[PDB]
Design a protein around this ligand. Sequence first.
Ligand SMILES: [C][C][C]S(=O)(=O)N1N=[C]C2=C([C]=C([C])S2)[B@]1([O])O[C]1[C]([O])[C]([C]OP(=O)([O-])OP([O])(=O)O[C][C]2O[C](N3[C]=NC4=C3N=[C]N=C4[N])[C]([O])[C]2[O])O[C]1[N+]1=[C][C]=[C]C(C([N])=O)=[C]1
Ligand SMILES: [C][C][C]S(=O)(=O)N1N=[C]C2=C([C]=C([C])S2)[B@]1([O])O[C]1[C]([O])[C]([C]OP(=O)([O-])OP([O])(=O)O[C][C]2O[C](N3[C]=NC4=C3N=[C]N=C4[N])[C]([O])[C]2[O])O[C]1[N+]1=[C][C]=[C]C(C([N])=O)=[C]1
Ligand SMILES: [C][C][C]S(=O)(=O)N1N=[C]C2=C([C]=C([C])S2)[B@]1([O])O[C]1[C]([O])[C]([C]OP(=O)([O-])OP([O])(=O)O[C][C]2O[C](N3[C]=NC4=C3N=[C]N=C4[N])[C]([O])[C]2[O])O[C]1[N+]1=[C][C]=[C]C(C([N])=O)=[C]1
Ligand SMILES: [C][C][C]S(=O)(=O)N1N=[C]C2=C([C]=C([C])S2)[B@]1([O])O[C]1[C]([O])[C]([C]OP(=O)([O-])OP([O])(=O)O[C][C]2O[C](N3[C]=NC4=C3N=[C]N=C4[N])[C]([O])[C]2[O])O[C]1[N+]1=[C][C]=[C]C(C([N])=O)=[C]1
Lengths: 296, 296, 296, 296
Amino acid sequence: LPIDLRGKRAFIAGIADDNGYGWAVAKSLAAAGAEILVGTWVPALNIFETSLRRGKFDQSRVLPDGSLMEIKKVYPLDAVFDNPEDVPEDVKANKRYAGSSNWTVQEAAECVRQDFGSIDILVHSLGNGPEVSKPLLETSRKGYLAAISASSYSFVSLLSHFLPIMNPGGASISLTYIASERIIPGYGGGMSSAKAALESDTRVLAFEAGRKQNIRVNTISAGPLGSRAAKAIGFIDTMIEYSYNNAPIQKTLTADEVGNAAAFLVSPLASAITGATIYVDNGLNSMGVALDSPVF
Amino acid sequence: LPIDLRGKRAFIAGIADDNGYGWAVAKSLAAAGAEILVGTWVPALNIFETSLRRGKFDQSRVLPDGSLMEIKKVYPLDAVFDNPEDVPEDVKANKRYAGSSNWTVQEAAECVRQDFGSIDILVHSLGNGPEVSKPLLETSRKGYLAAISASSYSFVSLLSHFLPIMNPGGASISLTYIASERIIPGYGGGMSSAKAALESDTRVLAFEAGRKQNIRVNTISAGPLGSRAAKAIGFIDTMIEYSYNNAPIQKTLTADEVGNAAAFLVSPLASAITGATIYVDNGLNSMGVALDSPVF
Amino acid sequence: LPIDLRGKRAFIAGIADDNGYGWAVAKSLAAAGAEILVGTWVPALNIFETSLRRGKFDQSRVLPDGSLMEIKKVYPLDAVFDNPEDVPEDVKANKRYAGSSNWTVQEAAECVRQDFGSIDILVHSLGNGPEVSKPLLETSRKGYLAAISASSYSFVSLLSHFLPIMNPGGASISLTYIASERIIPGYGGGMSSAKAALESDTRVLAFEAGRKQNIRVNTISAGPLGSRAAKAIGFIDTMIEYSYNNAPIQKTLTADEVGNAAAFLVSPLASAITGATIYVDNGLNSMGVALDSPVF
Amino acid sequence: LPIDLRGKRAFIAGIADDNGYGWAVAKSLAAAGAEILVGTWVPALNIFETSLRRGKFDQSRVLPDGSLMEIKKVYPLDAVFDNPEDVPEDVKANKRYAGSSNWTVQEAAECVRQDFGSIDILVHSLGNGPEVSKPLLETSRKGYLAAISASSYSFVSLLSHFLPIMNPGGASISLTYIASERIIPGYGGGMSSAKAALESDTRVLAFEAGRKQNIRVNTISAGPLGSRAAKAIGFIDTMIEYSYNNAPIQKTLTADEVGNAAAFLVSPLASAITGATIYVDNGLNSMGVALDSPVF
Ligand SMILES: [C][C][C]S(=O)(=O)N1N=[C]C2=C([C]=C([C])S2)[B@]1([O])O[C]1[C]([O])[C]([C]OP(=O)([O-])OP([O])(=O)O[C][C]2O[C](N3[C]=NC4=C3N=[C]N=C4[N])[C]([O])[C]2[O])O[C]1[N+]1=[C][C]=[C]C(C([N])=O)=[C]1
Ligand SMILES: [C][C][C]S(=O)(=O)N1N=[C]C2=C([C]=C([C])S2)[B@]1([O])O[C]1[C]([O])[C]([C]OP(=O)([O-])OP([O])(=O)O[C][C]2O[C](N3[C]=NC4=C3N=[C]N=C4[N])[C]([O])[C]2[O])O[C]1[N+]1=[C][C]=[C]C(C([N])=O)=[C]1
Ligand SMILES: [C][C][C]S(=O)(=O)N1N=[C]C2=C([C]=C([C])S2)[B@]1([O])O[C]1[C]([O])[C]([C]OP(=O)([O-])OP([O])(=O)O[C][C]2O[C](N3[C]=NC4=C3N=[C]N=C4[N])[C]([O])[C]2[O])O[C]1[N+]1=[C][C]=[C]C(C([N])=O)=[C]1
Ligand SMILES: [C][C][C]S(=O)(=O)N1N=[C]C2=C([C]=C([C])S2)[B@]1([O])O[C]1[C]([O])[C]([C]OP(=O)([O-])OP([O])(=O)O[C][C]2O[C](N3[C]=NC4=C3N=[C]N=C4[N])[C]([O])[C]2[O])O[C]1[N+]1=[C][C]=[C]C(C([N])=O)=[C]1
């Protein structure tokens, strides 16, 4: 009983190294037979491509079969910008941007349309919170709005823009986090607020795209992973040790584990699953208390 | 057993008339014996005051004890703007906005401080969505963000600002809606996303303000009430009628009922209640199927 | 704005000392003007009455007003037994039982009917788990079933039996616990399973009684309190310290705080609240992690 | 990307024919390459075997790879009874029950042990409610408990028993229903209470078995499928039709779809997923109003 994506195509918005979930989601979708089209945040695109081409990620490219993952094509992208009339002269002038073009979501989707004409799977695997290090109390309107835009509306734009080239029976998946639903000290700047909306949008978009084009929409609320961004937030390591001590099952969490879950959810086996928020966290979220409390 | 607010001051950002929830809360709080400060949205400000001069809501100010409400002072207010330094000379140029001043949330709170040195209760009963009529799929990033800015971040701003002059042991209340957690056709423009964020932040702010100033923070997920804003949305009547048909108890919903839950939630009686999302909707949210579906 | 129960009557199933929530729920309902009819588990009835009459609970009887709570009448009861044909000869012979009679739920309700003809409020505040000290894995079918019967169906019987004498506009409330919804190590024997069902039944009964007789049904998921039963489970003290360290607001939880919440929920102010599970726990449940983890 | 169960043994308590979910799971698991042990409820046992001798489900045993399922061994089983010492001589006297033996869960598991020394996967796909047709208000304590015993505790028993011969790294799956969390008219006899308990225990057992034997435990909240038991309930068709009308995606639901989610959830792919309640219902549970309501 395979998770079969053979003949399917996927657009993965959010890889820039072999260190996060997106890469992992990509091996899984690759491993299932899907054709990978990666969405790379412009700034990182150059180095990613270079590293990729020269082989920095070769081991990371080894599929379950021993074969290596192939990345069909890499498109530069910035999910905060929907169309060319939207970018600011400052943003355009802003260096890296000079080097690749057609990187707004609308443009990206267009290149893809022209390039392969359609996709089946759409994978959101990005976000950003300029003030993540601040408590909601110390978080500015702009910062808050930035987070919501980058981490939340970014999914709405991509889906909306790609939907027209998504083959019926296709699906999308995103990566959320428990902070949307529970208080997680340290995840500030409106990032919490952002997942909440991302998750809410999943249910809404599920209805809309489901009815519009029989496309499924879900999201995976993932456990902590020392990705690049995570390490940037700076609390992930403790979070990894927290999850290790206190989860129903005690073990490591691996990118791998979120990847397969995503591959499943975007496959035909998951045909009756839509509007979901699946927790791939070793059950952590289901705990009523932490085992490690000094009181115990 | 009284809900006792005597000697308590409350600042209710969110009245513009006597047709919506905010008025009801003022009332209940007035009834609870709290002193009423109000923050009307600048545009509506003049008319509101004017209307509340000619005795347009005289019948509407009568309390349970045939006593009359007494709104201490009305403040001009725009929750999208946190400080003067943030205003668009465009808005500033606007007549209403010219006709008033000190309306930024940072400005609004300083006045209360000077005028009254303090408060104990903050009520948020506003929000705006330029695109409520559009599906997430048809919703602009500008609109989504506007919706999240006026509807979610404004709470953050108000609380963050006023919190300094909140008396430890004080508390806050806001009004959310089910579309945040469940799919509700017609409630668009990212408003649903906005509620999700407003709800997520209640929890996080309960932690933040809870630990910083011993202030409580909750939100009430209210049922449909044909208010002025609900009027605009253009789907409430159906929802109202819908709720009549399909809730556990088949009855009406009156702001009055939302208004009492707020007074309670903001009173000492509710002291071990914080970071909650109390549904005051006649239990509709618990239903697993509409009773009025034709299959039945 | 008072919580007014004047002219109302309440039946409280579950007091045997002034140490738990039921007593607290009783002062609140008393304080609001309701007439108290207590339901005491037979075995404890004798001593409770004795202590009560002689004045062991006099201070505990002091209402907010300085006046003392009055307990209209005490009925003996055993909520595992619905009618006389249900008690086992062993149970009947079982000592304490000899001393009071008419103690099955059906009989109890009858005495009440005959005694006062109707009630408005119904308060469940009991349960029992013979194997609470055992993990679900080490818990026998009987033990599990016992817990469910005593702690869960006990509410269904009482409500069902009392409903016919409940005045329309009346309500009921019960006390649940987070273990139903999240993993709480130490609360075994199927007690976890029991709250889950108690909470589920609240939603169901809310629909049934709501539609049948316009009666409201809710439950309060309470924080830890060193009641007698709690101390019996043996983990409550650590739980109290856990809740103190890790809640959004740091403070003590007091019987008092659950009492007022219950008084509110059973009052007319709560007319649009039914099918609810309200958390009177200092926000504990909303936390995504424990602050006290050694990792932090 | 395969859902690989080769070399894995699975014990599926819950088949009595090819019309329900349990069969589907066996299939998917069969397909996944796992060896199929089955536990038919003694009454249905003879007929099931008989039916599965004459090739009554021959078409129904065909796998995705045109391969045929192959049920290693069928075990007679009654999940209300955990050991022989517990049987009512009344039941024992029963012909079917005479005609078979070793059917108590403790007995059933020892045979598997002897016969196969081990397992890796446990599927629970049964339950019974003598009173499903009665509202909680009309539901007997005997019926409620029977419902909870056959439907909730049986899982506890199976797991608890088999867990000793489960290979660390194994996992369990069960089938629950939305009535546990939401009000669903027609689903009575305390069945709803039973699901709530079954769901609550998944979490707790994920902790227990998770920490004790590194076994995972999840439940799938399935949508309506016109199975034999659903047939009896006498409300599925409506629910089925209802789900067609009001889910995010308007389509059918086939055991097949529940069956695949189980295979995944029990396969290594789902290794960081435990204590979950995955809704495989075409996203209906996320809807906030029935689209088919006449108000609309
Ligand atoms: C601050 C924020 C940011 S984000 O991204 O959003 N994040 N990060 C980190 C983290 C989180 C959470 C946690 C707990 S940690 B978050 O929020 O989220 C996340 C996301 O969404 C996803 C993925 O990520 P990761 O994998 O982790 O990382 P990386 O690898 O680094 O990735 C990222 C990406 O993105 C991109 N971008 C940015 N920006 C942008 C982009 N693109 C376009 N546009 C724009 N603007 C970059 O570059 C890269 O590619 O998932 C998530 N998570 C969840 C859960 C958990 C996690 C961990 N880590 O643990 C994560
Ligand atoms: C749509 C958008 C808006 S909001 O507001 O947010 N909303 N509205 C309406 C509605 C809703 C929902 C529904 C169902 S309907 B929503 O979303 O939310 C809400 C809020 O929170 C509150 C309020 O409302 P109401 O009361 O109803 O009305 P009114 O009276 O009209 O009020 C409003 C207010 O706001 C204000 N603002 C604006 N903007 C601004 C302001 N302020 C300041 N600043 C700024 N910028 C004005 O002025 C006015 O006064 O509530 C809520 N809810 C909830 C739920 C339900 C409801 C009903 N109604 O039903 C409501
Ligand atoms: C083992 C079990 C038992 S019970 O009761 O159910 N419980 N206890 C304890 C506890 C819990 C939980 C926790 C966390 S701790 B449980 O589960 O629950 C409870 C109940 O329900 C209520 C109340 O209680 P309290 O207040 O705690 O205590 P007390 O005072 O002791 O009370 C009790 C009562 O009951 C009665 N009974 C018995 N049995 C019976 C009766 N009656 C009739 N019949 C029969 N059979 C006695 O005697 C008395 O009166 O609530 C609850 N809670 C919840 C939450 C929390 C809590 C704390 N404590 O914390 C409690
Ligand atoms: C009613 C009561 C019973 S139960 O089973 O629990 N159920 N049924 C039906 C129905 C439900 C729900 C609905 C919606 S419908 B219920 O609750 O749950 C269920 C369970 O878990 C499972 C199974 O089912 P189905 O698959 O469907 O069917 P069938 O095939 O017929 O199966 C059953 C079985 O069981 C058994 N048993 C009995 N008793 C006993 C047993 N085993 C052992 N022991 C004892 N004692 C028999 O034999 C058979 O085989 O699933 C579920 N579900 C869920 C959801 C949904 C559904 C549908 N169908 O739709 C189902």
